[PDB]
Design a protein around this ligand. Structure first.
Ligand SMILES: CCCCCCCCCC[N+](C)(C)[O-]
Ligand SMILES: CCCCCCCCCC
Ligand SMILES: CCCCCCCC
Lengths: 48, 49, 48, 48
């Protein structure tokens, strides 16, 4: 428990960043990806 | 490939940014030293009479 | 070589300012104006 | 039904922010463990 442990929040941050970048390449837009990225909390709410 | 990314400049940026991000995260975990293991390994047998 | 085939061409097509036909920066003001005239002159020396 | 939602637009953006705050609350509220205790068809009794 002491040395290392809680590294999940950083990996979730990296996950969403890389997904946004990959979406940006797919659509060739910095803005359009947000239309997909805004759906994430609509899924997480159900799990919780 | 050049003509592909000439029309797709955001794609070109994405590839570069992902490479840079991967590199940034690597620097945090990468160990630091003067040299790597350049010295050949040794084994010593110690006995007493 | 990957950066030069992917990123560099994309930036050249979007970021580079148009250069007029015949312009070699010989008409620039200050140091860069002097250096361009020096180099253009040095190129003629070399080719000859 | 979707046709009527797009006429409103701004209304459902406020509902979205409540879901994000609702999601944020449940996540903070939810206790955290590693792996649940499983019934393995066996257990031990300590006598001291
Ligand atoms: C470190 C990431 C910064 C990327 C910003 C790129 C957008 C600026 C415009 C450049 N352009 C896309 C026209 O080549
Ligand atoms: C760490 C990831 C940064 C993402 C870059 C976004 C590009 C800006 C668009 C103008
Ligand atoms: C860039 C080199 C210029 C000098 C050429 C030599 C002429 C004698």
């Amino acid at each position: 428990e002491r040395l290392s442990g809680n590294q999940a929040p950083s990996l979730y941050a990296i996950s969403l960043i890389v997904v946004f970048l990959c979406l940006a390449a797919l659509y060739e837009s910095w803005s359009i990806p947000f239309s997909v990225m805004l759906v994430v909390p609509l899924g997480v709410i159900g799990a919780l | 490939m050049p003509n592909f990314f000439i029309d797709r400049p955001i794609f070109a940026w994405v590839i570069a940014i992902i490479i840079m991000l991967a590199g940034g995260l690597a620097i945090l975990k990468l160990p630091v030293a003067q040299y790597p293991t350049i010295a050949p390994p040794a084994v010593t047998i110690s006995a007493s009479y | 070589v990957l950066v030069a085939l992917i990123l560099t061409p994309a930036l050249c097509a979007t970021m580079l300012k148009p250069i007029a036909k015949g312009d070699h920066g010989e008409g620039k003001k200050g140091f860069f104006g002097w250096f361009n005239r020096m180099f253009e002159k040095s190129t003629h020396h070399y080719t000859d | 039904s979707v046709g009527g939602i797009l006429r409103s637009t701004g209304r459902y953006l406020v509902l979205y922010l409540i879901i994000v705050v609702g999601m944020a609350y449940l996540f903070v509220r939810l206790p955290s463990s590693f792996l649940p205790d499983e019934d393995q068809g066996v257990f031990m009794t300590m006598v001291q």
